[PDB]
Design a protein around this ligand. Structure first.
Ligand code: GTP
Ligand code: SFG
Length: 296
């Protein structure tokens, strides 16, 4: 693959993130789980149950096939086709009584940007996250870094009608120039759409900016406190000392620079390590909706 070094780096990121916060015995809710490419990371963590939900039935069927082909996974897997952002999770999980809610981890890997299509969907997504967790549980994930996106948008004069940037392996094209015309601020935290292309991975699929300050403010409203937010390059630098010995020779070699350090170079530096951030929140209190508590 032309992006093999990017894929290796981001899979290392996800190991570092998942295994930092997930504990043996945990129940994990994986929203937008895709084809199940993170099952092995949870095996290393020693979880007890994985609940994967994705709006695509085709990806769920592939996750089923992948689970059945894997050796020495000791946890129960529940896979569900359903929308995790545009509705509450209650109907989706009804046919699956084996699910052990409340859970210990909610994970959104490369998917929460789809929930930022509108305020109502961002709020529904985060309420689903908060409701599903134990106090002390964690919500973690990987999204494009809104601060890097703003850095890039700030380079364009307001006359540029469709701000676009990239390199040999990725490209971003914004729907419009409203940000620049609005004195270099988004007109709203939600619906800020761009098309995302990554060679051999994502074929011009629209997604939405996730202004991190808005994610944090909404999370706090729903009882979740920020523990960590770090661009991929800084997170990798922080965590790699713990992981070198754990990675096999082939995994290390797929991450290694010619100067002996581990990380990305060239066009993958921006596409993988600057473009994205991780995040982790902890549930600190139970959310009760305003005006929802009624007499008798
Ligand atoms: N901006 C953006 N990037 C994405 C999204 N989904 C995946 N990516 C990027 O595409 C890369 C490749 O993801 P995948 O195509 O699923 O490849 P993979 O990680 O090897 O997954 P598997 O083949 O299923 O094991 C990721 O590491 C991200 O950089 C998305 O929704 N938005
Ligand atoms: N509203 C939604 N509800 C549930 N899943 C969704 C929704 N919108 C998009 N998705 C899924 O989100 C996934 C996005 C992928 N980029 C990420 C998959 C996987 N978590 C990974 O890390 O590779 C796809 O599998 C989509 O089908």
């Amino acid at each position: 693959s032309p992006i093999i070094k990017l894929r290796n780096f981001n899979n290392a990121i996800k190991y570092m993130l998942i295994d930092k916060y997930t504990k043996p015995g945990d129940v994990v809710l994986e929203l937008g789980c895709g084809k199940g490419g993170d099952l092995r990371k949870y095996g290393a963590a020693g979880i007890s149950q994985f609940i994967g939900i994705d709006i695509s039935n085709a990806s769920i069927q592939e996750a089923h096939k992948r689970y059945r082909s894997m050796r020495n996974l000791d946890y129960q897997v529940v896979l569900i086709t359903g929308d995790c952002f545009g509705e509450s999770l209650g109907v989706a999980v009804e046919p699956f009584p084996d699910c052990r809610f409340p859970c210990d981890i909610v994970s959104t890997q490369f998917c929460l940007h789809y929930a930022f299509e509108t305020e109502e969907k961002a709020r529904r997504a985060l309420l689903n996250v908060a409701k599903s967790l134990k106090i002390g549980g964690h919500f973690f994930g990987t999204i494009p870094d809104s601060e890097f996106i703003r850095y890039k948008l700030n380079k364009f004069p307001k006359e540029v009608e469709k701000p676009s940037w990239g390199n040999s392996i990725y490209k971003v094209t914004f729907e419009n120039n409203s940000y620049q015309k609005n004195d270099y601020e988004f007109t709203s935290p939600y619906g800020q759409m761009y098309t995302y292309w990554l060679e051999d991975a994502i074929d011009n699929v629209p997604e939405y900016v996730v202004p991190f300050e808005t994610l944090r403010s909404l999370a706090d409203e729903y009882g979740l406190e920020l523990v960590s937010q770090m661009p991929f390059n800084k997170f990798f630098v922080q965590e790699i000392p713990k992981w070198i010995e754990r990675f096999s020779p082939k995994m290390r070699e797929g991450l290694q620079r010619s100067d002996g350090r581990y990380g990305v170079e060239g066009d993958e530096k921006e596409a993988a390590s600057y473009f994205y951030t991780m995040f982790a929140f902890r549930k600190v209190k139970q959310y009760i909706e305003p005006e929802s508590v009624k007499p008798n």
